[PDB]
Design brief:
Blueprint lengths: L6 E5 L10 E4 L10 H8 L14 E6 L2 E6 L9 H22 L3 E5 L13 H12 L5 E6 L2 H14 L1
Parallel strand pairs: 1-6, 2-4, 5-6
Antiparallel strand pairs: 3-4
Helix pairs in contact: 2-3
Bound molecules: 1-methyl-1H-benzimidazol-2-amine (3 copies) and chloride ion (3 copies).
The site of one chloride ion has 7 residues, from loops.
Amino acid sequence: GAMAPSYRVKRMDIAKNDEECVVNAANPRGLPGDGVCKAVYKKWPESFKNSATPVGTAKTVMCGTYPVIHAVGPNFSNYTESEGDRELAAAYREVAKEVTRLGVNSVAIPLLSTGVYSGGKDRLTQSLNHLFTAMDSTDADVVIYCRDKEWEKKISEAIQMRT
Ligand SMILES: Cn1c(N)nc2ccccc21
Ligand SMILES: Cn1c(N)nc2ccccc21
Ligand SMILES: Cn1c(N)nc2ccccc21
Ligand SMILES: [Cl-]
Ligand SMILES: [Cl-]
Ligand SMILES: [Cl-]
């Protein structure tokens, strides 16, 4: 575990993280995909061997000794708000189990279902709160990655609010 488990946010490519493992915002079929998923494919292509896994689950595949936790959030284009919300909460609970099993002291995480799977809606608060619900009981240092300068501010504010 980390000595004083924390949350942090960084606005940068998650493929250049400084943590002991990465969560991929995966598709169910283990395809190279777009956005975060394509950056993870470029950096850790070996981790996409048998990475396909259903919506609401996480599957870890090693790239060398570096763990890539493929977490499949729902595509809100296909899911109802209600069923989508349930699967998004579940994907994060499966991430917390994997981070715990691996015994890592740190993890790089994106906000699941906030990219092309958002169905166009702003889901910062919805996705971040499910991230907290899952990860609050883990003792890994969590480093949340985003692209948008204003999302970085909003995520930083939400972390500091609890401190
Ligand atoms: C959440 N997310 C994913 N998964 N891919 C992205 C690309 C750009 C911005 C945000 C993104
Ligand atoms: C930055 N950002 C992401 N990642 N998804 C969004 C949806 C609406 C507005 C802004 C959004
Ligand atoms: C496109 N993209 C990469 N490459 N890393 C990201 C982290 C968060 C959101 C979007 C991201
Ligand atoms: Cl960057
Ligand atoms: Cl997404
Ligand atoms: Cl973003």
